[PDB]
Symmetry: C6
Subunit: 131 residues, 6 copies
């Protein structure tokens, strides 16, 4: 998670495992009722401002292997080029929604913008995988 | 939640899931007995000074979709104009009780003021929805 | 709760729900054995230095509605005037033990003094209600 | 509890109820096996550097009313006059081991000295009450 | 765990036992399904930035002695020289993946670089042992 | 526990009871399988840098009275003198592995060194008692 520190600088801390497991245990599986976890994750993406690694823990903990895969491919399918249209260009897809750890630095506007987009695409992925 | 920090400045931390689920598990549903969750949320709105996002999280966890919709509707119906009378002017309803994430900056007096009003309206909404 | 922070600043944090429910679960009800919760709350009023809102949360959680109302009624009957003698003057009663949220600021000496007095009266009210 | 802060300034924080109840739940009653809670409290008196209020809370949670009264009685019997010999003079007994909240300020050397003595006497009291 | 604070200060805190045991309790053994604990540990290596001591504690808690010994053996088999080439010269293996506590200092680039390398080799070791 | 602050000053905090009881509850007794608790304590001695008092809580919580006494006996039997050779001279044994609370100031070289030695001897005691 990230939060704005008292000094005007973002501050990082890892998710407590109790939160992750509580979220899991108080909801149906994604397959049973996708709306439940999707709404929970949409909320957390905002309040907890997760990094890319944090998102991997969210997904890894709340979804099964098969569910996560569906979501990730759905998220990559939601990437748009600069012309606002879908794109399947590897470099564009990889840049927006990387499958391997990116070098995004949350102390930079560049890093922050990628994080914003990543979270937006993650949500889209879940919404579409649910449907 | 927001709390005043060491430098007389508001600091933010997300709700602990243990608190949210403890609140859920120790009270009847809103439909079952609205007074209990209403009183709890009234209290939490003050002690935890939640942001707009926190409020969506609080509500989404403690109320069903059906219940929350009812609550948000009553809240918007309780908005008053500068003449102390009910107002249905969309711009005024939306400015006081937005249904989508507003740009309220809690470090500013204006955002702080919007948050106090949002919380009062939410409470009025729960009270009215309860009746 | 309030505590003296590291910059000679009084610092606020909300009660943990785990503490509130643990206190309820490990004691008989106020009606069953008033002495137990009275002693617990007496202690907490000092160790946790609760604000007026904290006190409402505390009482609202540990006492039933009828119990709480009895306690507040008795607290208000235990107000004294500036001569140190009992008073029933509504203005002195409302100033020392408001039933609605006061404008008390814990960063001011006046607010702090009001809080010390409010907690003292709350204890008196619990003792008298118990008896 | 008290701990030395960064600048050698003691900082106060109240006991977590989870610690108090875990200690209770993982030991026999004082009456069943005095040495158990005695050793636990002895240790806490050092690691947590409790204030007078903390001590009341610790004893009030872990001992029954009757057990606690016996401990406080034995503690008071262990008070010594300035000559290092037993004293039963009420002014001396009350200054060293007050039954009512004293005005000790842990930010002063004298308040600190009073607390050290109080804890020492409390341990003696438990030891002797145990016998 | 290590986290970055203020304006760049690394800060150490030991793992919470609740986290370690939750991780253990919500996953199959390494021998039953290596990919699960592997993915979890890989994630933790990044989010919690564990020291060498932390890594021993993490492995010791989540893997049996046999499993842990296999992982460390494989990590050591995957050591490379500074030039990127594989090496099994004893001194270079020991420098990159020590079996005994090293004197790495996280306030120096040399220390931080050693820890980053250790975690990388640990991951490789788990993957290989898993295979 | 002790940890290093950014300014190089050690900072003390007491063990959470949740950690101590979790350690106890997730492991066999020392008499059952000495290796388990021994390894656990070995790890805690490093990550948590416990003081003498902390070590008493670890031992007193994780071991039975008989086991603890046996561990302390073995630790004291393992003491070495100024020559690095074994010694059983009372003053040297009591200085290295005191049974009563010592005056070790962790801000001094001498105090830190006594602590490191105490922890090493505690581990030796456990290993030897296990055998």
């Amino acid at each position: 998670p990230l939060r704005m520190g008292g000094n005007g600088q973002l501050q990082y801390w890892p998710f407590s495992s109790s939160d992750l497991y509580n979220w899991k245990n108080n909801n149906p599986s994604f397959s049973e009722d996708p709306g439940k976890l999707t709404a929970l994750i949409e909320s957390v993406l905002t309040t907890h401002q997760p990094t890319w690694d944090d998102c991997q823990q969210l997904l890894g903990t709340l979804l099964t292997g098969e569910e996560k895969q569906r979501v990730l491919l759905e998220a990559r399918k939601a990437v748009r080029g600069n012309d606002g249209r879908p794109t399947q260009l590897p470099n564009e897809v990889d840049a927006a929604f990387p499958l391997e750890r990116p070098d995004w630095d949350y102390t930079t506007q560049r890093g922050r913008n990628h994080l914003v987009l990543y979270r937006q695409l993650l949500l889209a992925g879940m919404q579409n995988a649910g449907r």
